[PDB]
Amino acid sequence: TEGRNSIRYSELSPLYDTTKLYLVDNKSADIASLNYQNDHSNFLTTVVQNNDFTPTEASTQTINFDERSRWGGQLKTIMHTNMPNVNEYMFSNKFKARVMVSRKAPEDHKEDILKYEWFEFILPEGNFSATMTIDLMNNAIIDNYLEIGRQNGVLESDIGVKFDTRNFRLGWDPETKLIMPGVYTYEAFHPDIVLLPGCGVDFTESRLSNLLGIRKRHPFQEGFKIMYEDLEGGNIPALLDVTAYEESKKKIQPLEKDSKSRSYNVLEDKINTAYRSWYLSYNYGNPEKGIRSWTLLTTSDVTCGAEQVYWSLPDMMQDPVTFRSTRQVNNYPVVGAELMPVFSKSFYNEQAVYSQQLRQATSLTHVFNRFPENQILIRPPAPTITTVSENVPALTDHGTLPLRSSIRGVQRVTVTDARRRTCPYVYKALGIVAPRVLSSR
Amino acid sequence: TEGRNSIRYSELSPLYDTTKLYLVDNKSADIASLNYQNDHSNFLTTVVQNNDFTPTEASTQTINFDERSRWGGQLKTIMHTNMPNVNEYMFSNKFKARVMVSRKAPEDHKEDILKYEWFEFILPEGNFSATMTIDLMNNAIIDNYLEIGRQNGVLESDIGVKFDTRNFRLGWDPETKLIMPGVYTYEAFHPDIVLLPGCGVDFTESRLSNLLGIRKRHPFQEGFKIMYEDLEGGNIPALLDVTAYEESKKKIQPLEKDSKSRSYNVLEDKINTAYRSWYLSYNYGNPEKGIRSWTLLTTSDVTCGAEQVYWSLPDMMQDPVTFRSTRQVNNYPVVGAELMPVFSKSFYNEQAVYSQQLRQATSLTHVFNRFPENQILIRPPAPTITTVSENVPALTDHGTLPLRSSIRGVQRVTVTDARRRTCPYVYKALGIVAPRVLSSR
Amino acid sequence: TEGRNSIRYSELSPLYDTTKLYLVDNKSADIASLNYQNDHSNFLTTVVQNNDFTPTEASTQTINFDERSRWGGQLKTIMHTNMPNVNEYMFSNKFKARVMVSRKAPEDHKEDILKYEWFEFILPEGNFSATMTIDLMNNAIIDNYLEIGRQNGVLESDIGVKFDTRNFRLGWDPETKLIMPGVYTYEAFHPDIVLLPGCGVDFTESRLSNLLGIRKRHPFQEGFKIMYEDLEGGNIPALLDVTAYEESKKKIQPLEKDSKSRSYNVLEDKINTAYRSWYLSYNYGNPEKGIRSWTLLTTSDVTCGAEQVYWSLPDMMQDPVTFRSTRQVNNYPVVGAELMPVFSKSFYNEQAVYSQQLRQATSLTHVFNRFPENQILIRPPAPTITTVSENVPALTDHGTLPLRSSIRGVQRVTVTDARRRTCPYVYKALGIVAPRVLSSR
Amino acid sequence: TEGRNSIRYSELSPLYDTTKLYLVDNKSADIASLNYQNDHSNFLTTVVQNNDFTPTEASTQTINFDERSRWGGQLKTIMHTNMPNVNEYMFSNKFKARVMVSRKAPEDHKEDILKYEWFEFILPEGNFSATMTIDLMNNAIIDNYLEIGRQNGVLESDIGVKFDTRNFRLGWDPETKLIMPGVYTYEAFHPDIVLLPGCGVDFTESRLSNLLGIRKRHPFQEGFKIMYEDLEGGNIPALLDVTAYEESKKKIQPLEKDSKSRSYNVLEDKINTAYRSWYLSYNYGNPEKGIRSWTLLTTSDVTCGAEQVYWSLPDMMQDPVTFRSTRQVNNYPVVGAELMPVFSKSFYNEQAVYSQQLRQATSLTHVFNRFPENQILIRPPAPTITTVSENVPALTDHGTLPLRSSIRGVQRVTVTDARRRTCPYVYKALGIVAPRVLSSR
């Protein structure tokens, strides 16, 4: 083992069989000279710590480890990131739906031809919770109504899509098939979608379908769209009229108008309305047809997907097996993998209804909750547990890999995504390599 | 060690005695070609990172490690899951009980033959807390009463089963054997069950018996059912009448009717009612007969059971000892074991009674708490600590195992349950294998 | 190293120098055949994973590792438990005290001979906080008074023992030696005990002395009992009368009767009462005699003692040094040690007085706080921080130990206490052994 | 290996091939003798534990490890620090802006020449949250107005810079281009800046730009300043007058004066005011010109930058490769790197508006929120999640490095910054070195 384990720089003393190599980015010389167009995910840094050499003339010395021995040293990384919840880079603020336009009469409810098209709604970006994002989704539909649908003959009783977090079944007397208290329960179950005949939603090439918790049984197929004609057996039951009920006590019928004459779209029967729900058609319906054979129920996910991240270092380590040696930017043979450092955290406000009753009195006149009298179009209640994403630092150890014989003065580092593109939310990157001796030659 | 440690792919340069092998699932080529019917728990992926080959024609190259040496490399996995609390896959929304039907008079309390049968109640699914699941269990009994028992001669004073979280003994004056304040304590101890003569509950092939905290001393026997005739010495003491007490002060007897004439089923004595409780018969009864010799008292468990999970990988590693080499799906020799990544977390609301007094005023008219005047049938109070499950990622290191000589291009992975079936709630799976050299040949 | 490292089962292929061995308990064949009388702490399981053999006929095959080599493999365990705070198994619901009975007059306060004896109070079991357990201790004294002491001549002013969490000194004007506001401070310091002449408490063979925080300087001596004659220099100062004070302003004396004529047992002087306190005699007294030379002050401990746990495995590993090879159940040579997985957690309610003022208005008429007018017998205030125990899973690595040459098909596992008895609160146990090669033969 | 592995001190027994060496700073002899001018980041300590020698005469003995062998031992450190959020050492309380002075009339809004200059505001230091620092920034502008701007002709309607956390777009009816409720939403989104024509802010050589979350796409360029002429397409829309609206109902125009006649600087149109916002010009503007092509949106960062820290030890370890052996203080060859132990933590107050409505009634008359009637100059609302930094201890393991042959009695330690200067907030430093044997000689 002796003799063949020296580490010569060029003119200093030779070391023996253990050093360290620091890949930092906070040198004050590289900022003005080498790195001028690139950022913390694709920077270019030096290894020599000599400061008799500007880094343009330090790109010539070679730290040549001794030959007749195979070398190789382990890798330790420290990265630290800060990305928001909703952003444009990871496709988290887009969803397209199909809502109604141009309700006009031709020249009796056997008239009024309705029209429909697709839109690709877009909501703002920031770091939000799991409930505030629902209110931002439910604003991207109404500001389409205030632009296009109001000037035509739409009368704000047939919007079509509305994201809600209730169960429209509690209180269903099976003898009369109506809800007894004359109001729906203001309780906070799993979120769902509410449709209307002629509408639908599409979550293809988006990421908000992980936030709601509506997955798919075969997650590799073609795409993910939900129409009105898939929610069979999931109509919301009609609401009993209680102010026209006490004439029997000095008789029973559904309610149709609520203080402003908004129709509930009650059908020809006197049992249920014309609104279909996802959560009510998943377990109160048929476990063979429609839904429950096509999707799956899942808890909410605020960080909306945990993707992997690839470290690359193509001037020190040798290439792993089945990798082509290239200098194109988006191939760069991978030296280690990790997970993206974005976690989740629960908080348990526990009130969630008084804290919603009082919040829209000192902070919010009517900007959210525009329709505070209709029971279906009312604001959804907040859950008793709330979840917010957070960013933590990550300390990792990637094991040993063989390294080259001669190491150049300037070095590249690269931190990529799963689709080979640099993540712009990386704030700090830092690595330490410690070479050892392996088998002889 | 030299010479016999080369790693030849087929046409690239030979490596020496350390590489890495990435088993990812997020390749954009495998989605359209190989994996079309299966999901993240049973997928099929490639190892070659060459991108001159579609993965149908990359299933031919062999990464043959060198012979005349025994190889073997350690394994590191990263999995991430999201399952709800109550679901159908792990038998967490079923329990059967025996309640009453058809109370009619034959042609004096020596009449009215009562009947009884079993039902297998079913409650909805989602992610709930430890108290909201109690209210969902206590709704699956009343909606049977509103369907079958109300149309027969049942008068809603003899329901039979009711899940409660109180202690019906605090305030028991031993001289007069009645409760002095004329009301039970609205305090929040361990949950129990409340029976009535002719009823019972059965938790065989279910999992909700871990949520309540009612275990069994010999947990391997046959099953787990609790009848009325096991709770001997656990009758709830009768409640003293205080509004007919101040006639002595210008005398003592139990109370029978409460503002709506609901009978408390007071016995022939004037001491105790005809309701038996589990918690009151476990420590105030007999430590030899009945209960305390058959069950055990345990804290609540929201995740309801911590089961193990098995990794399988039958194209790279060799088979461990006493395993048969097969290609049936539900045998697949196991390469490592872990724990299912579902934890628990406490929150301490600390109010739990004002936050229950005020919650059913802005959110809930009478949907829960249907009987808000009877002391036994009243809503149970919430504990001062609440517990909710949560899902975290899991980073594991499984040590070294010997691997085969030639590795095919396409590889299988499989993540199973304890009863050899694929868990559908796995969202991300990821592995890294790093081969080393062992003994020679 | 080659040649002498084979692992033959009996009829499969021979492995080489690394396997794994799974000691699971969730096999569906062992439940019906082998394990029928025992539980998760002392079960009996198989190693062969062949399923051509029922485990009664699989107790014959031997996985014989190769001779002429010393073997040995490391151990990894996963255990998961759920025990309550207060229970009978770990002596956490017993304490004996000496209170008063039979105050009768012989035939002037030179009469009324008093009597005293010991009782061994017992309180119920469950999972409670650090303050609710104080209220349960303070109920086990009053229900003795309502049974035996009330029928004799005891007049509920001389109970004798009362667990309190205040400091009865704040507001002591040194000129007049009385408390100025006419009320004690309703503040929430360390808990103590309150005695009365002729009483005492004994915490021998109990565990609640760790919950209060009253330790002992020499913790190995004989036992732990505290009488009235040890608290010298710790009398509570008497309370100034303020309603008979404003006659000086159109004079100073202690108060004796409080709205129901309960005597404070004021002494012959007009300075202090006849109640002694532990916390007030520990630091306001003498640091040489009495207390402060015999006990110690310690923070509260909700889990009440962290005991160790021993793993045993007497069919695979060899015996460690100085252990006798036996098959009695309560010796079983130990293969590794851990800690019991019961932690503590703080919550900081921060109100603790309004949340106590309002709690006994919607939940509690007078069941606790029976005497809500006497200042000494009033309910103690809750601390501003509260602590509750919790149960977490435990992942441990115990290092390497040498194992036997031939391994039988059926195996024993055992998880014991520090006094060699099986803990009944173990819910899941799981181990993995991975053999390696050590020195030759 | 035998023979050549002795460790001779000078006169004790020789050890063999494993010891430990403790670098503590809490010796009571070094405080009075060696360390008299320096602190915990640059102290000077001994290794001999003999106490027959004062450390002035213990700087002569040499713990000479054996020659004809290369030695080297691993390093473990324990450091513990306490730095505030806002301080002077890390440039966290400085920002310069350009506000207005000397509005006087020359001798019709075609007069009143305005003047502008730069100031370098300075705010106090301490440990604050993410919202209280915003209020301290917004006080450093007004106390300039009360000193210089009030005595000239400035009329407190044209301050110019104001840090706000709202979105001034919610409620924008696209038909009339005004905000319908007549008030802005008191909601708590990402923070931004609010400008006025003729002003600007500069965050060069500061650190508060990481607290707001306004990053830059190329983070290496020259500096970071934001003027009014970069925020094109981001004017705040004007506010509709609702008290002059009900004359149509027994008509629509912007509002200009608010109860004290403060002008909103409404433009020649009747659509929008003359205030530009950052958050409203980032996503409602142009994704090609102005902003969104130059900056980036990021969550808040309370610790404001995670910098690295360097351990140095220039009397025991040998120098790593490409380091010059020197005794100047600010070079000192680095033996290991870490991260600064300052983390972040979220708390979720959840009220944030009632807790702001009530906070400025019992604690704050008008010191903050000086203008509680103007909608633009009102106090910004607090977020529903708040983040505070915290300090934790750090336990690290730095691997092995080769050490010298003879070790002197006195030793140096040094803990530096990224710009080679001693951090004054280090409270405890502690290291343990354990030598082993490497290759022979």
Residue numbers in the entry:
A (entry chain x), B (entry chain s), C (entry chain u), D (entry chain o): 49 to 155, 171 to 313, 367 to 557
From the paper:
We used cryo–electron microscopy at near-atomic resolution and implemented novel, cost-effective, high-performance cloud computing to reveal architectural features in unprecedented detail. Close inspection of our cryo-EM structure reveals notable differences. No corresponding density is observed by cryo-EM. Consequently, glutamates E466 do not extend into the cavity, but the corresponding α-helices are slightly shifted in the ADDomer. Rather, in ADDomer, two neighboring protomers engage in hydrogen bonds in the vicinity of the twofold axis, extending from the S61 side chain to the peptide backbone of E59 and vice versa.
We created ADDomer, an adenovirus-derived multimeric protein-based self-assembling nanoparticle scaffold engineered to facilitate plug-and-play display of multiple immunogenic epitopes from pathogens. The penton-forming protomer of certain adenovirus serotypes can self-assemble into a symmetric, hollow dodecahedron adopted by 12 pentons comprising altogether 60 protomers, effectively representing a proteinaceous, nonenveloped VLP. The protomer represents a two-domain architecture, with a crown region comprising the VL and RGD loop abutting a jellyroll fold mediating multimerization. The RGD loop contains a conserved tripeptide motif (-RGD-) mediating integrin-based internalization into target cells.
